[PDB]
Amino acid sequence: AKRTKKVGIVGKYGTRYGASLRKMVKKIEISQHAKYTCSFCGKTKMKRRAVGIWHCGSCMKTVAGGAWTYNTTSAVTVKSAIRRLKELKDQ
């Protein structure tokens, strides 16, 4: 609450588009423009390049992830279920 009270990133939109829409898009913007930690090099340089495309500055590795977040909950659940099914099948 240094410069703005309760808008933060959506301060660029001004008074337009409605309060609820700006509040809804605030979390999406924060997740989209956040830099994540790459689980290949250990550095916090994972940045979103395009929709579902995440790139590491150091590793130079591109990872196919979510649209606005590096990992979606559905993808993690599917990965866990696939690992469980593989362990049940191959044994």
Partner 1 sequence: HDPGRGAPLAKVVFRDPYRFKKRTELFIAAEGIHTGQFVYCGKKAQLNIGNVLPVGTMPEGTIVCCLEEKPGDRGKLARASGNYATVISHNPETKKTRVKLPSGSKKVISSANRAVVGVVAGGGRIDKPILKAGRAYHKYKAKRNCW
CA–CA distance, 69 with 35 (Å, rounded to integer): 10
Smallest distance, RNA to C-beta of residue 86, A:
26
Interface mask (CB under 7 A) for RNA, residues 70-89, using x and -?
Answer: --------------------
State which residue, 8 or 82, has the beta carbon closest to RNA: 8
Which does residue 26 touch among partner 1, RNA, Zn ion, none (CB within 5 to 8 A, set by kind)? none
Binding status of residue 7 toward partner 1 by CB under 8 A: no
Bridge partners of residue 64, in order along the sequence: 53
Determine the Cα angle at 1 with ends 24 and 18, to 5°: 30
Beta-bridge partner residues of 27: none
Tokens standing for residue 86:
């593989």
Residue 56 CB coordination number (10 Å): 20
Question: CB-wise, 24 or 82, nearer to RNA?
Answer: 24
Q: Which residues bind RNA (CB under 7 A)?
A: 1-19, 22-23, 29, 32-33, 40-43, 45, 49-51, 57-60, 67
